[PDB]
Amino acid sequence: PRDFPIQRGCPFAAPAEYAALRTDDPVARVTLPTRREAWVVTRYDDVRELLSDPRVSADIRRPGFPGEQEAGARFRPFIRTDAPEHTRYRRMLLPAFTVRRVRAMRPAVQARVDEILDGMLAAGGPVDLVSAYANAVSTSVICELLGIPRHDLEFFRDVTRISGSRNSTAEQVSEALGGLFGLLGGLVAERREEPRDDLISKLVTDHLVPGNVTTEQLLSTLGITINAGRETTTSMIALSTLLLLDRPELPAELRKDPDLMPAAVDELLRVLSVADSIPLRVAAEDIELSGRTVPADDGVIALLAGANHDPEQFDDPERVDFHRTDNHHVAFGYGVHQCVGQHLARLELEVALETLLRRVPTLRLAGERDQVVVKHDSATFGLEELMVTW
Template sequence: MTPSAPRTPAAGESAEPVAFPLARSCPFSPPEAYAAMRGNGGLTRAAVPGGKEAWLVTGFDDVRTALSHPASSSDARHPAFPALGDGEQAVAAELRPFIRMDPPEHTRVRRMLVGEFTVRRVQAMRPAVEEICREQADHLLSLPAPADLVGEYANRVSTTVICRLLGVPMEDLEFFRRVTSVSGARSSTAAEVGAALSDLFGLIDRLIDEKAQDPGDDLISRLVNGPLARGEITRTSLLSQIGITLNAGHETSRNMIPLAALDLLRHPDQLELLREDPSLWAAAVDELLRHLSVADVITLRVATEDIPLEGATIPAGDGYIALLAAADHDPRAFPEPERLDITRTRRNHVAFGYGAHQCVGQNLGRLEIEVALRVLFEKAPGLRPAVPLEDLPLRSSSAIFGLEEVPVSW
């Protein structure tokens, strides 16, 4: 069923809906049209794949309001859900990952995971993450230059970290790369996504049986012998929640690490500050997250009631997308937002989302990006791109923006 076109809000109407999603012309900046949208009353009507229309929310304050309002629904079963890929809504509606649930169901499932990603538990993982990054940096540097920073470093780091956290055996890096590439691509059909996830769920299903008999010190073991054993979650739902945790945990870091490394190389003054004062790394990661905002279009929502914004209203029943990169480049919130400034004092970006659905794994993401970048620049101080930046292939069809490959020399 295709819902009718959204009703006109108080402000922000455009004559014709904008075709969405929009591609980035530069990998280090949001689409140029976002700036104009922020000046158009805060809401822009958009035509999304599948024949639907939705509202684009662009201002920093409006994005936070739209994501934290009680009428903000993430339920993919809603007819107006503004899916950006052919297979996205069908698969999410069937599998019900917790990121596509609403409270209280979302709250109940999220509570099972949140304890695994506290600051204390994540900091306890630092030595293991350091070891993984050093091993993978050594692997990269053992190859003849130029080598691919994405495939030979970032993908290997992100896959190893999330698999070790979950307790998934590291038998085939390319298996996880293929699964996440297909399941996270906007261009994938429902059948293609379903087939990729079926392979992943087959592996996880076997692990559930193994860890019920022989638990380890990992997330799957704790979920299997805790909530599943107590009947607090079904096996089918557990498969879905583990799958989305693995997928999201892999994709964000896999895309952020090479893009952030290049962003620092484009700003040698900022990289020099980090070399002079390594205590700035935590702040640098937050600024890079804001500057790049790779999860820009993942916040798909439906308004179950009217949601009033600063200069407009999202009407009840309409789908909308809160654009994280547009918010993180709002000059009212971040002066000179296009400038990378690791000493920036305001760090309340929305790169990990906002509200009840703010990324549950953000503490691990920050740690992984920080350690991966620091180790990379320590071991390869002469790191440099081996091709012009404008020639790098963009990963525009993915739910998480990134680069397909980044040839580098050192």
Template sequence: MTPSTPEAPDTGASADPVEFPIARSCPFSPPDAYAPMRERGTPTKVAVPGGKEAWLVTGFKDVRAALSHPASSSDARHPAFPALGDGEQAVAAELRPFIRMDPPDHTRVRRMLVGEFTVKRVREMRTAIEEICREQVEYLLSRPMPADLVGDYANRVSTTVICRLLGVPMEDLEFFRRITSVSGARTSTAEEVGAALADLFGLIDRLIDEKAQSPGDDLISRLVNGPLERGEITRHSLLSQIGITLNAGHETSRNMIPLAALDLLDNPDQLDLLREDPSLWPGAVDELLRHLSVADVITLRVATEDIPLEGATIPAGDGYIALLAAANHDPEAFPEPGRLDIARSQRNHVAFGYGVHQCVGQNLGRLEIEVALRVLFEKVPTLRPAVPVGDLPLRSSSAIFGLEEVPVSW
């Protein structure tokens, strides 16, 4: 994949591409290597798993340009698609979740979902989410110390919220945790991902039949008795779209809630501001999303035509990854980006991506994180980490960054 145009990116000093993904050294910061890449001003060539090469786009303006260009393709069937896991491309190419589609297919499927995640509809869910978070914080407090903020709170909150939205019965929390852990891990093979998703699709398939006969007030019921019944989507595609909605809705919040709680505990002056003035919570959530950027490497793309950036061009046919954490820590866009500042005026971060593929569930994600954190700190004011943050195991092999466990005391 050697660029042939004079405006192609500079590959850097080394002839050998950098190995990617790159691990974080601190859970609150992007990988250290991102800053020098961004300062160079042009995309960096990297070697991704499976023997492919791709470009990393790191600057804030370039990331937005690369994600909003009409030649930016998310189609996993493209040979140059820069998958970061052995099973990722094969499964996505077969199942075709809408996040791995291009318009007009992407537009058609997204339109079926977007009405469920409007500001108005999400606002109507606040009371239910508050009830869920209060129930789960009581469960956390019932556990022997140190309890696990991931398994005993965040996972339970995120799974319950997305399952209620979809209309999926909450019979086994660990079932959903296992499915998302396997399907979202870069170390999983295509066979392992396929087996995990087969279990999930088996559950959803049964629900489709049930809700066709007895619909409820939930997303699956509305999709089954709307687009599916009218022939606007196939059953196979519906399974895929429900599966990715459940996975994405679970994983992002499951990882953000404990990591954001630790970030606030690590910045007690910011937490004090929130305790003094709870009206600051919505802005604080946006700043935490920017600061942590857990979906950093989800934006895998292929350039179907040359894509011009400020200092270079991504050549047609090449794969690239627009790094959200690198963009959200660009000092030209966010002064002192490493500092958590809940009063920061800039709200134009790209934590939910950018362009036509910007996260369809971002309104729900913001509300869920806000309520989960606010209830947690109101009910457990003495919450503290039970081990040093530097000793916590990182989920570096997952599509969404997070922590494996967070032991806490109070």
């Protein structure tokens, strides 16, 4: 008779009903919208170790929910394989990802956010954020990641808009795809020749051209790569914003001394924890966890939020306090699955929020609390429309 909660309490996030299911059914049973039964974990350490158990992988029956489906045995998406197929992709790509690398694009991520703003304020209007800033950056961040060039960014921003979201036609969606990959291969072939030092560059030269880089396979992952970031951060940005945006104290601290958003972005990431439902893992075996053991071959997701607001982790978890000692959160992943992406997802996230309140201080909502609208369509969380001016 059981369900998994939207909730989201709204305001801000996210625990919903979980307070009860955190203290008590620490592993309670709950139906998925597909009415397949499965298991759900809500206590910080439960959520984490559970996550990096030896025996927990992704694959065939019976995980997640998307109507549909344990089908397909869609190949790849390697973000739902266990090892040794999944690892050889994950690692195929880490060396690129890293930090020494990620803090490097510090000037180009800055650059880009700045140039996108240049227009924000130039076409003026009381405009929607999510669509306008929020997405804009996100994509373009990832452009800067994959070496995507000059301003064939709308060559790009477009097959994103189309391909990804709401309504097609299937053919004319499938047509979007056509470009994205005309684009990619464009590049995939181009960096074989004059290889720059970006993500196609990394994947092509080191791995591709001499390894099990099979140009079937690249585009695949480059696919799975863009799909990491467009929706998930855009999410974390425009929500993070709306938080700040309606609770002035928060900008406050962040202005007295702007050496914060780092701590802030970690803190928001935790507290917003929009990444909630990680995959879901089928339990490889029976597994002890606060003793209630999870049956061999069952569905078990790990609620990132539930865990992110567990007091066993850190005191007073609702409070968006920025000067916490202790916030080894995991709005990102835990264990060999964890968000490879997140080093970006931080520069994405600070340069984005940072500047919003540098260059455009107190913009405000065009809309009203009572017509702001939160997306809920993917499990990764976000907002449909956010409406502002300055």
